[model samples]
Target: NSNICEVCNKWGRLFCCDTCPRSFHEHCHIPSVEANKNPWSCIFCRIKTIQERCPESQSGHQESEVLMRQMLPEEQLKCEFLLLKVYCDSKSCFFASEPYYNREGSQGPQKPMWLNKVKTSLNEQMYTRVEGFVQDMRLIFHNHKEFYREDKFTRLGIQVQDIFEKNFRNIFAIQETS
Candidate 1:
């Protein structure tokens, strides 16, 4: 014996909506019941409740997820650099070698002059492009290895001395032309 259910108008195992007279096949509910709650509403009734509660918000509520992987290489680098700067900036307040001196001082701890210069240069679009980057970088810099190498970095044509050089002058000393 087979008959169509009233809510879905199809035949299968059914769960009836408590809010309305309609009965739906388990899969027929718009947001399917995950747990066996006592009361349930059909898709139609749920939409009606939402519309009744906040008619103005419905249009703007559903925003798409932001995917950072698709961002431009320049944008990504800027994000990484910005985060490195912010993270290094905040490090002092949480952990410091000598922080007690500030408790009695009339002036607050002065920030690095470089940070103020950078803040003045940023605009709205520039700010958000690195917002998620800063968050992601916080998670990033927490790991063991530093992201960029510290010691070996140098600019071209600069008279920087090599760190690994050894003055083995005694080995070839007094080797006169013979």
Candidate 2:
């Protein structure tokens, strides 16, 4: 019943998933939703189906069960999916395009981080573990906060950070420890 696309976190023409509460923009979804594809399901639902059909124990446990695990193909896809979710937001474009240029009398990021850099690291398999990818994602937000201070851009970073964390937990099936 949500009015916004889950991936991009934006309001637009949305397609609701049959199996979940999530809605998505047509082009934002993997395989891209088409009209008349009634009962369309989101990627998370599809991945859950695949997981259920092939349990980890029977499949020899190549898939990650936790965030600290090594990067496997399944985990890699999940990371990429998370990145796609971030990239779908137009606000993320500001972070993706380039490092924020330093302004007068203000310190820029000590070490710049961006969406594209994370994508490249994932593509090159630079990450040895899923935690590595997560750190970089967090770093992008950290850099933004350091440079932007209290403003819309900082808030934008926070918004995307929230989106990333929520989807990351769901996709990775990470159980929070109290």
lDDT for model 2, on a 0 to 1 scale? 0.76
TM-score of 2: 0.66
The residue-by-residue lDDT of candidate 2 on 26-129, one tens digit each, is: 76675457568677777778677767876652332222456578888777767878887777767777778568666665697767788878877877889988
Lowest summed lDDT window (length 10), candidate 2: 56-65
**What value does the lDDT take at residue 115 in candidate 2?**
82
Q: What is candidate 1's lDDT per residue for 6-107, written digit by digit as tens? A: 423566787767787766565334233436777876554554564576665334211122223333433443332332223233331222122222223233
Top lDDT hit: 2
| Least accurate 10 contiguous residues by lDDT in model 1 | 160-169
